[PDB]
Design a protein around this ligand. Structure first.
Ligand SMILES: CNc1nc2c(CCNCc3ccccc3)c3nc(N)[nH]c(=O)c3cc2[nH]1
Ligand SMILES: CNc1nc2c(CCNCc3ccccc3)c3nc(N)[nH]c(=O)c3cc2[nH]1
Ligand SMILES: [Zn+2]
Ligand SMILES: [Zn+2]
Lengths: 354, 354
């Protein structure tokens, strides 16, 4: 496989489906990346993560640098070997205070170095993620700093031959909710040049309507021929709408975290499995889901497990929710390839919100 | 398969190896039964429990009657269906205050009824487990009460046709550390008649030397042609010594509980994986273990997981420890069948305690 190749196989409106080829494997897009902050996707073995359909997972510069340490993981053979995942890993840069970086120490150069030490396949530029709400002045200052940091990221990555030759580098667009700042950011990133482009600074309290409004003008500012990654998104309906606006990649803690908290995603909407109405419900979590959890266990059992604080409850809820997300992405991919994504999006929503 | 058949295939001293045939499957003896108190063997899917080699698991009258409720589990199709384990289940009776029973309500009749509602394959008589130390008078009174309760258990089980026809009933010997009381108890149980006989009231603070001393005279008091179950035992070396004294069945929370606490069993002795000496140790938990955990993950990773409080840490430690216990039982079975168990016991100990 090449270091990096993104091919678009089909389109419908702003929506795209295709593949990212990398040395450690192929990524089908639109893609959902399970999050694994402490070098584990919580409560799941990697084979289970893979079984659910994930092609790529997300790791974190900030958390791993603190524990167990980036140098330590490199000494032990890198993150892939350490946690037992041999497919691509994307690492966030720790961006989610001086011009040099952030002490708490992280700078563009150290960030890129840590991602190298971890052996990340898709490296994110080190940014400043702009709080919401932000005045235009502050959003501008922060965006500008990020673009400077973007160039610094690019140069550090490029200066490390093994990294430049085997991994990919994504730039992150900032600018808050302001169209002109988003455009300046996109321009700057495109001029520097990256393997893919993320939309940063969303999903930070602005709400779906505003998020979608910003996506409406921001995603077409990015190079069309490269992947578009929406960081930190999101709920199933967020994902569908974002794909309708041209997003190809997603990460989110929702399926894992809310799973351990009793929230199960279904095609009929989320449910909270701890509610007493499930205590004698022999149906599986979701009626159509193909995952092994729904093949074998009842709502009633899982209700009991979660109420009892049992680890198997977290395990089963998490496997189910990640499988659910992967099935969602598969149905998205399939409908775009068949040119019926807009109808799928409508059908999904009618039933999810019924 | 029959309701119950115990066949002894080989012997060495007091040690025996054979099989218990029951409707839901065959149990190889000497057997280790993983404990699953809240209708789950903590942090493991049943398929994983089975993969490690378990033939039978243990469930609990006391815990399940409280949550989620025995009637409720029966309504949902029984414990096997509920938790997804289709092989034999042994249930303890809640014995671990008046002549009628125990309010907190449990009596022999209710206990046997709850085990029926759960659909247990091996039902334990409802006993009074005698605290240690006990004076002879108190041990006698408690033992006598248990024998009365033993008869009551037998009659309740026998009065329930479906139970009597498809499950088995084990009696529990009491008597503390006193030979004459143990003998009276054994006699009483044999006169009533059971499918198997447990040695109760040990492993309750007396220490290995005393436990083994009591086993020395107590196990030969039990019918030779029926299984001998030591309740609540134990550490790997406890198990070996108890088999040398004629025990065929064991249950214990140690492998699961101490696994979540960072304790890993190895042929070189237990280790505490959280100790800093493992933080960069790329060897698997145990050098010879065949389990999937040791096939794939390092001490270093698991050290990190447990230190970080990650659920995967509990999962991997628990799978390993239960596999370890099953491997122990397999080596015990094999060496007895080959007439080299005494040599195995010596070799085991030399290395485990080196
Ligand atoms: C939930 N909304 C949200 N997430 C955002 C992230 C983090 C992406 N998720 C990875 C992660 C997982 C756990 C802990 C920390 C990070 C961002 N990362 C960066 N670098 N820059 C952003 O603008 C930015 C914006 C975000 N909004
Ligand atoms: C650890 N030492 C010990 N365990 C003993 C048990 C319980 C066996 N293990 C099942 C279980 C697991 C978790 C919670 C409760 C029970 C006994 N059970 C009964 N019925 N009678 C005993 O004499 C008796 C003596 C014991 N000693
Ligand atoms: Zn499912
Ligand atoms: Zn192992």
């Amino acid at each position: 496989r090449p270091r990096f190749s993104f091919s678009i196989a089909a389109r419908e409106g702003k929506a795209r489906t295709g593949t990212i080829e990398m040395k450690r494997g192929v990524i089908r897009t639109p893609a959902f990346m399970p999050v694994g902050t402490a070098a584990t996707v919580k409560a799941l073995k990697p084979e289970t993560v893979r079984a659910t359909g994930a092609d790529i997972i997300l790791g974190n510069t900030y958390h791993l640098m603190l524990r167990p340490g980036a140098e330590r993981i490199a000494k032990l053979g890198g993150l892939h070997s350490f946690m037992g995942w041999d497919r691509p890993i994307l690492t966030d840069s720790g961006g989610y205070q001086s011009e040099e970086g952030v002490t708490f120490m992280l700078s563009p150069e150290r960030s890129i170095e840590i991602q190298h030490l971890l052996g990340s396949d898709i490296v994110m530029a080190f940014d400043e993620c702009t709080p919401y709400p932000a005045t235009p002045s502050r959003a501008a200052s922060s965006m500008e700093r990020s673009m400077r940091w973007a160039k610094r990221s690019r140069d550090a990555f490029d200066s490390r031959k093994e990294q430049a030759e085997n991994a990919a580098l994504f730039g992150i667009q900032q600018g808050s909710v302001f169209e002109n700042l988003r455009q300046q950011s996109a321009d700057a990133l495109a001029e520097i040049g990256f393997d893919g482009y993320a939309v940063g600074g969303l999903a930070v309290g602005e709400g779906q309507d505003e998020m979608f409004r910003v996506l409406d003008f921001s995603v077409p500012m990015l190079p069309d021929d490269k992947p578009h990654y929406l960081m930190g998104v999101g709920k199933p309906d967020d994902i569908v709408g974002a794909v309708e606006r041209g997003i190809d990649m997603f990460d989110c803690v929702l399926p894992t975290r809310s799973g351990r908290n009793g929230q199960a995603f279904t095609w009929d909407g989320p449910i909270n499995i701890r509610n007493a109405r499930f205590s004698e419900d022999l149906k599986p979590l979701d009626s159509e889901c193909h995952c092994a959890v729904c093949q074998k266990w009842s709502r009633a059992y899982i209700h009991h497990l979660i109420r009892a604080g049992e680890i198997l409850g977290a395990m089963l809820m998490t496997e189910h929710n990640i499988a659910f997300y992967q099935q969602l992405m598969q149905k998205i991919r399939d409908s775009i390839s068949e040119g019926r994504f807009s109808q799928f999006a409508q059908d999904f929503r009618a039933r999810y919100f019924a």
